Symmetry: D2
Subunit: 111 residues, 4 copies
């Protein structure tokens, strides 16, 4: 598991559960090609997106579907989605995000 | 000025100066059309991106060029950009300030929206 | 104004208005002596806490009364306060802006320090 | 384990390892009484601070020794320490912090 995504909720003080996450890899013609996707678990985590063989160097985008998350909770949000764009460089990447209705924090833990 | 961007540096404790910012707007055909661009001043602020007339309803993407910022400082950072995507003006005109606080492997972003 | 505090609300996307702020300075005997206090304006800013003369070197604690803020809004939050503790003016006078971005169970804080 | 502390480093993209953490509980005369302490592990986490029997309702302060962390890395920091003050209310509390030299983010995950 070279890539993990973890999402937290700063309003409820909880994991952000059942958040849709879409990963894309940038193609040679600069378009974004679907790569992997899933929904966060009860712990706010999404494991199993990819494998070491399939996760080659390149630019990736992780699109967290925050708008739908907030609406399912009855809350009015600002962003369409949170976006995390980075280069994978030859390590286990954890992309974390801490969500509020009008704000988000994101970090990477690369170990 | 209905759209302002402010960027801060969490390593130095300072405005993030000379940060390039590109704004896009989603077109009818669902592509990201160029909308405006500029770079932050010595206060970390970027004013003058657009006008009340040109800033219509739509889905906007504010792309803050954080990798280019850190690289100009001699630092290899994690993210390519910070990308702030939001629907604007769908209840009438509003004024938006998009703020970001930058570190090499992390950022925060918020919005202040006023009527 | 060598010390300014700015507070934003990450739920509403707005300044955090009417936030009480208490500043303390560590005394010789290691207790926290009162130094200044005030509350944020309609822009989320608090100016006028102290003067160049009174703002000497020392260890300062800026206590932002976030629980009192959220409770006044009818919300039960996690933290009692946000507490920003730092050495000031130890290389000569500087100007400090302490900023905070508030959510019910979380906050961020940064400093902008200028000469 | 009713209380866990996790600390991350936003400069290096890593857990913040060997950070000293001191917990205090507010006493009846409003002083802060030492309660528990430890150092974060290789994962940035500090487990085993207290037990359910010893962690009663009250106001607690978690003081993360960020200044010494940054100095051991050769970096010049702003804060003396990060402070997280909260009421425990009768759940497993995780206090997380994301550190930069001039800034920190903190959240609670209460599950
Ligand atoms: O908004 C300002 O004018 C500002 C001025 C100084 C420092 C920060 C500022 N904003 C800000 C933005 C984020 Cl994203 C954040 O996390 C925190 Cl704590 C603050
Ligand atoms: O909580 C975790 O396990 C975690 C794991 C890896 C990276 C970050 C983590 N949490 C976290 C905490 C804060 Cl204060 C924050 O702002 C952001 Cl974005 C994330």
């Amino acid at each position: 598991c070279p890539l993990m995504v973890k999402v937290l909720d700063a309003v409820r003080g909880s994991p952000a559960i059942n958040v849709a996450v879409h990963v894309f890899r940038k193609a040679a013609d600069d378009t974004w090609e679907p790569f992997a996707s899933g929904k966060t678990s009860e712990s706010g985590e999404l494991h199993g997106l990819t494998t070491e063989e399939e996760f080659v160097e390149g630019i990736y985008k992780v699109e967290i579907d925050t708008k739908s998350y907030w609406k399912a909770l009855g809350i009015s949000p600002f962003h369409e989605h949170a976006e995390v764009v980075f280069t994978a460089n030859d390590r286990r990447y954890t992309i974390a995000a801490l969500l509020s209705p009008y704000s988000y924090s994101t970090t990477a833990v690369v170990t």
